């Protein structure tokens, strides 16, 4: 929903606080680092899909055919 | 028939209060976790006796214990 226009920190900050709804606040505290991901845009997936047709030409070479 | 300690910590976070319980602690007990941290800031709802006290026999907060 909302880590478009919004920062990072806070975005951590809140998804933390959900986290302390879902886990125990002595856990994590003891965590080294919580990092929080971002859907993928399109040049993302554009680079998702070469590297998945670099391994479906992996497979077709090992099949034989270029 | 009183509690020994009883106070309330005025200041800013992170100063150094987790650093005096964890003192008291290491003195008077001789540990750092020989203590209890427990946040009371999620408990703004109903569920607050049902959570921090002891649950309802077969509700959210009953299968940690207490």
């Given at each position: 929903?909302?880590?478009?226009?919004?920062?990072?920190?806070?975005?951590?900050?809140?998804?933390?606080?959900?986290?302390?709804?879902?886990?125990?606040?002595?856990?994590?505290?003891?965590?080294?680092?919580?990092?929080?991901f971002?859907?993928?845009?399109?040049?993302?997936?554009?680079?998702i899909?070469?590297?998945?047709?670099?391994?479906?030409?992996?497979?077709?070479?090992?099949?034989?055919?270029? | 028939?009183?509690p020994?300690?009883?106070?309330?910590?005025?200041?800013?976070?992170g100063?150094?209060?987790?650093?005096?319980?964890?003192?008291?602690?290491?003195?008077?007990?001789?540990?750092?976790?020989?203590?209890?941290?427990?946040?009371?800031?999620e408990?703004?709802e109903?569920?607050?006796?049902?959570?921090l006290?002891?649950?309802?026999?077969?509700?959210?907060?009953?299968?940690?214990?207490?």
């Open positions: 929903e909302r880590f478009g226009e919004l920062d990072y920190a806070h975005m951590k900050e809140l998804v933390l606080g959900v986290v302390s709804h879902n886990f125990r606040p002595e856990f994590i505290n003891r965590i080294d680092e919580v990092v929080v971002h859907p993928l845009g399109e040049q993302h997936i554009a680079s899909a070469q590297i998945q047709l670099k391994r479906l030409y992996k497979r077709l070479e090992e099949r034989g055919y270029e | 028939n009183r020994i300690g009883s106070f309330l910590f005025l200041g800013p976070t100063v150094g209060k987790t650093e005096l319980c964890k003192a008291l602690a290491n003195f008077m007990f001789d540990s750092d976790e020989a203590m209890v941290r427990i946040d009371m800031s408990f703004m109903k569920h607050s006796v049902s959570r006290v002891g649950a309802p026999p077969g509700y959210v907060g009953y299968e940690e214990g207490g």
